[PDB]
Amino acid sequence: VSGNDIAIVGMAGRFPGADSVGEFWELLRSGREGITRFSDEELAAAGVPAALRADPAYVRAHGILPDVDLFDTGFFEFTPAEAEVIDPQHRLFLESCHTALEDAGYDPRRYDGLISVYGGAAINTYLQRHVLPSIDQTATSDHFRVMVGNDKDFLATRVSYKLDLRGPSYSVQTACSTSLVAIHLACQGLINGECDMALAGGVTVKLPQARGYLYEEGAILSPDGRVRTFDAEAGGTVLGNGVGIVVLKLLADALDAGDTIHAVIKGTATNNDGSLKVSYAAPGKEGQAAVVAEAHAVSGTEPESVTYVEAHGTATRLGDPVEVAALTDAFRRGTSDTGFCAIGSLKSNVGHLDAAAGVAGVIKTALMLRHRSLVPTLNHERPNPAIDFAATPFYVNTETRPWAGGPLRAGVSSFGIGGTNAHAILQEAPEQGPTEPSPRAEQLLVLSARTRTALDTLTDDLADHLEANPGTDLADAAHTLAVGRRAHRHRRAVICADPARAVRALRERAEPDCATAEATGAFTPGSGRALLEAVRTAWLDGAEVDWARFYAGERRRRVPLPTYPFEGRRVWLEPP
Amino acid sequence: SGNDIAIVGMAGRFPGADSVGEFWELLRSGREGITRFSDEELAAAGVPAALRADPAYVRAHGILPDVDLFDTGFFEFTPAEAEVIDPQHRLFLESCHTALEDAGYDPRRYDGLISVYGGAAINTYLQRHVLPSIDQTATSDHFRVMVGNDKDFLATRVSYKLDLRGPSYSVQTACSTSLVAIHLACQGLINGECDMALAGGVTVKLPQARGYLYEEGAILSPDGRVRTFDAEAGGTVLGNGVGIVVLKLLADALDAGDTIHAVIKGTATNNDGSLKVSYAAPGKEGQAAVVAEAHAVSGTEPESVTYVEAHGTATRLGDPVEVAALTDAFRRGTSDTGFCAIGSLKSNVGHLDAAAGVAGVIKTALMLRHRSLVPTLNHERPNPAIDFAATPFYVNTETRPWAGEGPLRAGVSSFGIGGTNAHAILQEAPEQGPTEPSPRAEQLLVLSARTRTALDTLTDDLADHLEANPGTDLADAAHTLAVGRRAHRHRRAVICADPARAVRALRERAEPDCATAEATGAFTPGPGLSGRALLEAVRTAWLDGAEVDWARFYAGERRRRVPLPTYPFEGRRVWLE
């Protein structure tokens, strides 16, 4: 019932070793590491000097993303000369915001409400390494061009401009807690009625990607390129590039709209440690415990009911104990029970994603809730002896297994250098009844893209999806493809009764089940198969169809389906 | 009521005005703070003879003096640590400190949660100074650079160095940054996430002693003037600046006896989206919507608003869009015309980028407290693309009393490249009766500093202030100096009956009225210890370094926190060459 409850109605991201939220789930539930480890030859080839590579403390590991130089300038209406000055972090952020809205099933141009954007980016390496050496900043307009392309202030607002979002749009920046803070601020804006839907998250793309790092005692990075969270041999973390976006709405609104709800954010808290700690970069035990206890209080969730925590996970021998002690302190304010809450960290799989780390935590946890599954934390052989886990609420889960009990509830932590701490409580989505039966025997599935090759990719992606998710309601899918996707020039449409037949029709591409065309004015039908055929023919010929009116009265849902397969060209200023 | 926020303190530095006090004087006087350089001065700053001889070169910039000077000892940095820090960050930290001192709050003897919200302009120090000086091969080197220079550490550094435990965020929305920060702070206060907030922003573009090439279709003026609302508006001029406001819920400020400069009745933000012709264009529709929303959330009828501090950049297209937008929003509530003055401090000091919004709020809070309008500069002929007579608005060009039937109210706008708009409604502070007389015969004024020289400067500054403001209530000033200042190692304390005798004792520096020491238990005056013996005992203990509970010492009296001179930072050069 609660006015504080926020639904996650869509998500998107790209992570080391996992180029989509769906692939991230597969990585996690398989217990796989997504960090790349380079050969010495690869690093020579990327230009790392032999002298640095030969240092026995040099570690050949980094979490990287494929294709961060490719950008679909056609799709986003940029010329290549405009786009090449823009930080790839900003480009990736834009693509992921678009993807997330598609995942949620919304076309902003048809949404009756205000959409906000809250996000942040890691430090910009593109500006120095690529932009400055190539662009003369003498004229005011060239200096402006560079600033707008590269300063963090333009990250979120570019998305608002390009996707036509008219709620508040902010870049928020708090170092490693950035994307969870963005989610906190997005939730407050929703609760306090400033927007009706929000995009929140963050991005990190540090360049060059193909590079290791020099192990240094006293700095936060691990000596072997592994992240051994909670383990006796915890020795530091490994950095990774990534991006994540969540789409958020009040729970009541999501339920009324028939959105897919992946999880509910019950509540979120933030604070700062102030000066209570040994240095600016050190963790703050009292600040951490206070943020968790405050998150419990504002969520109305008793600690006994929380049975997974996604830790911040410094994976240091000294930091992991502070994190667990702070958590233990917060939980002990509401229970004396022990051994009931699993604790884990996706950093063990993919590294520390900096600005994207908080939203990555929320995405993992929402996936866990949706699949009702715990997953392993990696590299965990012996628990850190400084943590008497058995005296605490917590145990380290190292197997994929069911998450049983609920409603299931979890905590997510994100703590920054500088001491602004965040904690969120998530709860499993509520049971909804079955979807309403369709008044038609068959459904019309519409697909469109800017190019014939993208259309073919969409067509095969949708087939793989309906194969893999055979229980998908076809009427809800059809509705989502109609109301939740912009209509482009190259068009294909299938008429069939269920997902299995759709797979075949999409793969075979023959009439009369499948029809194709490269695209007049509005078409409004004046029943049965002929109804679907007449709408199909008009739409394929480029008529504008009012899908909202076609589905009027059915209470269709929006459901996650494959999203636009961006076709980038290389958009990069080369280093000299 | 529940949405009302009090501005209880402020600090800043602006082109031609190195404090909020000097900024008032500049505005009241109708003076321009933008510096116009001679060709000599610019050769001296090292601008090429070539650029200097180009007919399109404009020799103007709003600058701040001695941004290479930082009191490393006071803020517990080594010079090595500090020189890697963006001077924008240093300045923001300094002004945050100053703002708290102005409001009368010592954050280390403070029971609640203080938050910080702010943003910084693009970092030019990093490119010109930091990167050419530091090899970043080692992780710890990369971290030193990042932590000194990324926007992420602007606010949190303050929380760490000043011990503030509310949430602390950097927020960045280009030209609207500091007004968005103010909006988020107000929301934090209303939501109960903190009980006092610092909000603002900072711009320090380098090098400072440099003009620019005028270019058609870019946003800068061809003559180095900012001719807001004028027919000759031709662009803006950039300036460096910093501003911070200290915010609390109104009811708490009234309960505490804080000095209240103005009340923020409500704030709103939005984004233009794509409802305008380009990313960089001003958005009439979004601007109108943010103003109208600010009126709705604050419960403010447009006809009750009699000044607006416009975003007011003086671009050819900007100015008519801004006025049409405001007129759109106002017309939703009233058809009246000619009742609301409009102005822009950008005409005096340029476009302060991240600090522009907070600068607007400060100007407007100053107007409200002094009950005075002030000129907008360079205004000779209204832009004929704006038929002002058909709108609520007229351009005010005179310093004069601001008066009205209902409480004075004003709007403040700030609009950013990229379309995130903000507008705030401010109202005059409520009436307060006279401050409650102390029944004590004498007050105890304390002063402390990190160095003997700073102590001597504070002592003279206080004497000066009490001489120039001889109506200052001595008990309120004693209270403020006690509860609103951290006690440092070098200490001085005067016992006196009134301000004039305080002035004498501070200047003569002689026992028994004045005593000085270098500072260790707690000292609690026993019952019955009264009058002069009480003050001598408290003085002696405090001078020796004992912890005195000042709240206890003043607990029988309703005391106020009032604006007094703040710490005289003693910078040394901190600049990576």
Side-chain angles (χ1 to χ4, degrees), chain A residues 2-40 42-108 110-430 432-451 453-503 505-517 519-568 570-573 575-576, chain B residues 1-39 41-315 317-404 406-430 433-510 512-576:
Chain A
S2 162
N4 266 57
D5 283 345
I6 295 308
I8 298 174
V9 299
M11 311 175 306
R14 306 176 51 204
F15 313 83
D19 225 36
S20 67
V21 173
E23 290 183 4
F24 185 41
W25 182 243
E26 167 65 13
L27 185 87
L28 289 171
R29 82 185 179 191
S30 296
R32 285 178 207 125
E33 193 190 80
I35 294 157
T36 299
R37 307 173 63 82
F38 309 93
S39 75
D40 186 58
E42 288 166 337
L43 294 190
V48 183
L52 185 52
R53 279 186 289 116
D55 191 304
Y58 193 75
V59 180
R60 302 195 305 255
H62 193 209
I64 70 178
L65 295 175
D67 297 332
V68 299
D69 63 331
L70 303 186
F71 187 60
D72 199 332
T73 49
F75 192 91
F76 288 102
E77 301 178 76
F78 282 108
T79 65
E82 291 169 329
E84 68 184 358
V85 62
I86 302 171
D87 187 0
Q89 300 187 122
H90 293 210
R91 287 182 247 162
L92 224 71
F93 192 84
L94 172 60
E95 293 171 322
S96 289
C97 286
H98 185 271
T99 303
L101 284 168
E102 284 202 346
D103 179 72
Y106 282 95
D107 173 4
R110 324 220 282 294
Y111 178 61
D112 179 37
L114 292 170
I115 303 174
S116 283
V117 187
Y118 300 77
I123 193 163
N124 181 347
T125 48
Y126 189 75
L127 169 66
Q128 273 73 212
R129 194 183 156 76
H130 304 270
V131 184
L132 295 175
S134 322
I135 311 301
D136 37 11
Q137 285 199 71
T138 51
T140 301
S141 49
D142 299 317
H143 171 76
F144 164 107
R145 265 158 34 66
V146 167
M147 172 183 87
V148 173
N150 287 276
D151 220 12
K152 299 182 181 207
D153 304 61
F154 304 98
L155 178 74
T157 59
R158 187 181 286 100
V159 178
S160 299
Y161 178 72
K162 286 282 164 160
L163 307 194
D164 200 12
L165 317 179
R166 306 183 193 167
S169 191
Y170 311 144
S171 307
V172 59
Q173 301 289 161
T174 62
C176 330
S177 53
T178 288
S179 52
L180 194 56
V181 168
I183 290 168
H184 170 77
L185 294 179
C187 293
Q188 305 317 295
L190 291 164
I191 290 165
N192 296 111
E194 273 178 86
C195 53
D196 303 289
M197 179 157 70
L199 310 183
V203 56
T204 300
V205 185
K206 281 173 206 151
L207 303 172
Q209 295 205 91
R211 203 150 81 178
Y213 63 87
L214 188 54
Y215 172 68
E216 171 173 4
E217 276 171 31
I220 63 157
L221 305 183
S222 102
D224 61 1
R226 264 76 189 202
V227 182
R228 308 181 182 274
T229 325
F230 308 116
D231 189 273
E233 296 194 82
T237 194
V238 176
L239 302 180
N241 292 337
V243 59
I245 302 290
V246 289
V247 190
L248 305 174
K249 181 180 297 203
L250 289 170
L251 174 58
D253 292 353
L255 286 174
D256 285 357
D259 290 343
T260 292
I261 298 163
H262 302 266
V264 176
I265 302 176
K266 295 291 279 156
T268 52
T270 57
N271 69 17
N272 194 280
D273 295 329
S275 65
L276 272 181
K277 51 209 214 147
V278 53
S279 76
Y280 183 61
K285 187 214 149 301
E286 281 90 345
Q288 293 178 22
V291 82
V292 174
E294 183 165 333
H296 292 163
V298 82
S299 297
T301 55
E302 65 276 21
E304 236 162 65
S305 70
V306 177
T307 59
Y308 183 72
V309 172
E310 178 70 10
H312 173 52
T314 63
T316 61
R317 187 187 63 73
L318 287 177
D320 286 338
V322 167
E323 179 167 16
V324 175
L327 279 167
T328 296
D329 195 83
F331 271 58
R332 278 174 178 178
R333 292 171 196 191
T335 179
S336 289
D337 289 5
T338 56
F340 67 89
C341 185
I343 194 161
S345 174
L346 69 89
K347 300 185 173 64
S348 72
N349 308 80
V350 297
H352 197 330
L353 313 176
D354 194 336
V359 64
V362 168
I363 289 172
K364 165 174 170 191
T365 300
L367 291 161
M368 290 168 51
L369 286 166
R370 196 135 178 283
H371 292 273
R372 286 204 136 236
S373 186
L374 302 182
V375 302
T377 283
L378 306 191
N379 316 121
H380 189 76
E381 303 270 37
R382 314 193 285 234
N384 187 323
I387 312 174
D388 182 4
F389 272 108
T392 77
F394 309 106
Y395 67 94
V396 185
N397 182 66
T398 60
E399 303 268 41
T400 298
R401 57 162 60 82
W403 189 4
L408 302 176
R409 295 167 168 168
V412 187
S413 288
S414 192
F415 307 138
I417 298 169
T420 284
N421 301 311
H423 194 83
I425 307 301
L426 275 71
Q427 184 169 301
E428 69 186 29
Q432 294 168 44
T435 198
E436 308 262 25
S438 159
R440 299 161 304 276
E442 300 189 290
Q443 308 305 321
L444 178 48
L445 307 157
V446 308
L447 286 177
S448 71
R450 296 193 76 256
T451 62
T453 53
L455 183 64
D456 286 342
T457 302
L458 264 176
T459 297
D460 287 322
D461 281 343
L462 176 61
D464 293 345
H465 178 89
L466 293 178
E467 178 162 67
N469 299 278
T472 296
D473 184 78
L474 203 68
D476 288 332
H479 168 251
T480 303
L481 293 171
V483 305
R485 300 286 186 276
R486 200 156 76 274
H488 308 280
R489 11 285 135 201
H490 292 283
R491 297 188 181 201
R492 176 168 291 147
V494 160
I495 301 166
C496 57
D498 60 67
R501 293 160 187 286
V503 172
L506 291 157
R507 287 175 179 164
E508 291 191 24
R509 246 155 275 213
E511 271 155 16
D513 315 70
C514 188
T516 303
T520 60
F523 178 86
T524 300
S527 94
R529 181 75 186 208
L531 169 63
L532 300 179
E533 292 288 356
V535 175
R536 178 162 70 177
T537 294
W539 187 77
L540 283 181
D541 293 353
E544 183 167 54
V545 173
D546 190 336
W547 294 122
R549 186 221 296 234
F550 185 84
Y551 289 103
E554 289 179 44
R555 313 202 175 258
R556 298 267 55 93
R557 296 179 179 168
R558 289 171 164 83
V559 294
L561 293 168
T563 56
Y564 195 95
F566 300 117
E567 292 177 322
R570 183 173 225 244
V571 166
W572 205 249
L573 290 172
Chain B
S1 321
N3 279 21
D4 293 342
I5 299 294
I7 299 173
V8 302
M10 322 182 307
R13 305 174 51 195
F14 315 83
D18 222 38
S19 66
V20 171
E22 289 184 7
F23 187 41
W24 181 241
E25 181 53 39
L26 185 89
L27 290 167
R28 235 216 323 122
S29 280
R31 284 183 195 114
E32 205 193 63
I34 294 156
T35 301
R36 308 182 66 75
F37 304 97
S38 67
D39 187 73
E41 288 168 348
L42 280 205
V47 186
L51 219 31
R52 276 186 298 121
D54 179 336
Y57 197 74
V58 176
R59 304 200 301 270
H61 194 210
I63 70 192
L64 297 183
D66 315 289
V67 303
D68 56 349
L69 235 42
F70 187 66
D71 195 333
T72 49
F74 189 85
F75 287 107
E76 280 166 352
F77 287 107
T78 69
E81 294 163 2
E83 69 189 0
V84 187
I85 305 173
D86 181 0
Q88 299 186 127
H89 293 218
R90 291 182 244 156
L91 260 75
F92 189 83
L93 171 60
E94 282 168 321
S95 306
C96 279
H97 190 271
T98 299
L100 285 168
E101 284 201 334
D102 184 67
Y105 280 96
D106 171 2
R108 287 181 164 83
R109 292 295 181 278
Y110 184 84
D111 290 336
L113 295 170
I114 303 172
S115 276
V116 186
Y117 301 79
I122 186 154
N123 181 352
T124 48
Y125 189 77
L126 178 62
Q127 308 304 334
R128 288 182 63 78
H129 297 282
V130 178
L131 292 179
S133 299
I134 300 302
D135 180 282
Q136 298 182 66
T137 297
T139 302
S140 57
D141 290 321
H142 175 53
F143 275 65
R144 278 181 276 271
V145 168
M146 167 184 91
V147 175
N149 291 280
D150 219 359
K151 299 183 183 199
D152 304 63
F153 304 99
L154 182 74
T156 53
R157 186 178 281 103
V158 181
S159 300
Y160 177 67
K161 285 294 180 177
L162 312 189
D163 196 25
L164 316 178
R165 291 176 204 181
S168 183
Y169 319 121
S170 297
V171 69
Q172 297 293 162
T173 63
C175 331
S176 66
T177 287
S178 54
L179 195 55
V180 173
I182 286 171
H183 169 69
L184 293 172
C186 290
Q187 301 331 112
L189 289 162
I190 294 159
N191 217 43
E193 296 180 59
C194 57
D195 83 331
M196 182 157 72
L198 307 177
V202 58
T203 300
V204 187
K205 295 206 163 69
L206 305 165
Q208 297 200 89
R210 174 194 262 188
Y212 56 97
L213 277 171
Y214 169 75
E215 164 180 18
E216 290 178 62
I219 61 159
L220 302 189
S221 162
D223 61 7
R225 314 290 180 170
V226 175
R227 300 184 186 279
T228 315
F229 310 123
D230 196 85
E232 295 294 307
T236 207
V237 178
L238 305 181
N240 289 338
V242 54
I244 299 293
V245 293
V246 186
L247 307 177
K248 288 178 62 165
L249 292 174
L250 179 52
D252 296 338
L254 290 170
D255 288 343
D258 294 331
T259 296
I260 297 171
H261 296 272
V263 181
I264 300 179
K265 303 289 299 283
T267 54
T269 58
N270 70 7
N271 188 278
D272 294 333
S274 72
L275 199 62
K276 55 185 184 181
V277 294
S278 71
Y279 184 57
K284 193 219 174 213
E285 302 306 321
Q287 292 179 24
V290 88
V291 174
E293 181 57 17
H295 292 161
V297 310
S298 65
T300 296
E301 293 294 345
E303 52 261 81
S304 80
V305 170
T306 57
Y307 179 74
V308 171
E309 176 61 19
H311 179 51
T313 60
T315 53
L317 293 176
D319 284 347
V321 169
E322 176 160 24
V323 177
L326 281 164
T327 297
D328 181 322
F330 275 50
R331 283 176 178 166
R332 296 179 205 192
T334 187
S335 56
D336 292 357
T337 54
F339 65 82
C340 181
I342 192 167
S344 183
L345 65 93
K346 298 186 173 60
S347 73
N348 310 72
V349 298
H351 192 327
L352 309 180
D353 193 336
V358 60
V361 170
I362 290 170
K363 162 173 170 188
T364 300
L366 286 170
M367 292 172 53
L368 287 164
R369 178 174 173 67
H370 296 276
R371 303 190 110 266
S372 184
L373 304 161
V374 301
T376 294
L377 303 193
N378 310 127
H379 190 83
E380 316 221 342
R381 172 166 256 129
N383 188 337
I386 306 176
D387 176 8
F388 274 105
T391 75
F393 311 102
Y394 66 91
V395 180
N396 182 71
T397 56
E398 299 299 320
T399 294
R400 60 191 178 92
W402 186 10
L408 306 174
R409 292 179 176 167
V412 180
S413 306
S414 189
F415 309 131
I417 294 315
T420 282
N421 303 312
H423 189 85
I425 302 306
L426 277 65
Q427 178 171 304
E428 73 187 22
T435 191
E436 178 180 284
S438 174
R440 289 181 167 129
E442 292 178 311
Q443 302 295 322
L444 174 63
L445 299 185
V446 302
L447 292 177
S448 68
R450 191 178 140 84
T451 62
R452 285 176 292 269
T453 49
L455 182 60
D456 287 353
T457 305
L458 274 169
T459 306
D460 295 323
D461 285 349
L462 183 61
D464 287 354
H465 182 266
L466 295 171
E467 180 177 63
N469 300 272
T472 306
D473 180 73
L474 193 71
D476 288 342
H479 172 245
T480 304
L481 293 172
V483 302
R485 303 282 184 276
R486 184 174 192 181
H488 300 286
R489 60 189 79 187
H490 292 97
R491 301 185 185 198
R492 180 165 288 148
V494 160
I495 293 176
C496 60
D498 58 43
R501 289 210 268 282
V503 170
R504 288 181 201 96
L506 290 161
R507 282 171 182 166
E508 293 181 358
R509 249 154 269 209
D513 305 316
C514 184
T516 305
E518 164 169 9
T520 80
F523 175 74
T524 303
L529 187 59
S530 197
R532 181 60 177 237
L534 170 67
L535 304 185
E536 293 283 8
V538 171
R539 181 162 74 177
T540 291
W542 184 80
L543 291 174
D544 292 352
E547 176 72 21
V548 173
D549 185 344
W550 292 119
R552 177 174 175 86
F553 183 82
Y554 288 103
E557 297 184 8
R558 299 183 175 80
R559 298 266 56 94
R560 291 184 182 167
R561 280 164 171 85
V562 302
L564 298 167
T566 63
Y567 192 89
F569 301 119
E570 294 178 318
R572 49 187 290 179
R573 181 167 182 260
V574 171
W575 202 253
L576 197 41

